[PDB]
Design a protein around this nucleic acid. Sequence first.
DNA 1: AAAGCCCCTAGCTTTTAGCTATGGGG
DNA 2: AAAGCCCCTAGCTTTTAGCTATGGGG
DNA 3: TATTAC
DNA 4: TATTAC
Lengths: 125, 125
Amino acid sequence: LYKSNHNVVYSCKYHIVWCPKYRRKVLVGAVEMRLKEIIQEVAKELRVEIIEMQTDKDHIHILADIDPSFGVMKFIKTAKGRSSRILRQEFNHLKTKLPTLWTNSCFISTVGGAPLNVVKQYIEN
Amino acid sequence: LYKSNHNVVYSCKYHIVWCPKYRRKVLVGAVEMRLKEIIQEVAKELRVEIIEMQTDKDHIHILADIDPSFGVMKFIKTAKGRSSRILRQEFNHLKTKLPTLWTNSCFISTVGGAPLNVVKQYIEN
DNA sequence: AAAGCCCCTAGCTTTTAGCTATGGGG
DNA sequence: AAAGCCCCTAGCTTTTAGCTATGGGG
DNA sequence: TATTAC
DNA sequence: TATTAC
Ligand SMILES: [Mg+2]
Ligand SMILES: [Mg+2]
Ligand SMILES: [Mg+2]
């Protein structure tokens, strides 16, 4: 349930959602497939656990467990920036029709780190 | 329910728990009272919302909403570091009987950012 | 109007392009 | 053993301090 | 150099 | 420079 780095015991899960620039419906077909693949690789390299990843034509939603000392924002900027650069190189229509693949924004909402019965042991007695 | 900085919309809540060095039972009386005041001041200054804060003789538990761009660790570092400094200056026994007031560790667990009814609106159609 | 659109600086990128920053101007 | 105990180095606040770091050694 | 909401 | 778990 809980993982630890050298100094912290944690379980930090977040729903993360972001969309393409201008809300263009470009997360389809081959682009959707490659995007997921790039996110999985970024996560693997960043010691981030992807619990769920869903895409629709105009947004991607990820539920991930991320070390708090690392920072959810660090994972997000790498996932977004790397996917943008790679996808725009691989799918020219993404590079020629848009100034960037993503926007400067995202949505983030924490999720319970573990069921109540488990967390209780650590926060109450 | 959701707050925003210049680029992110969020609601990140965390249970945070840490204990005194050697698990000494020093969080009592005046020490406990002053510790809470200090942490409330830290939260105010760092734009952190303290939902709940409780102390037992050997640990403190805080439920807080923190901007993810700022980082839960930056709040923890300040809350622990400043309270150690001030409390050790104010209560001489905390300085003479211990090398530090706290340890290098803490426990962190995310809590749902908003009621499920509200979250679904942002993560699913 | 803002997260989302336009503009800016400055730190890092298995990305030297294209994302961040409790970042700033509309 | 590790989060928790001992040890260590940078960075940054709280500065003849005392905490972090996806930090390191036992 | 112009989007409309997951 | 020595803790035992919230
Ligand atoms: Mg250590
Ligand atoms: Mg802006
Ligand atoms: Mg038009």
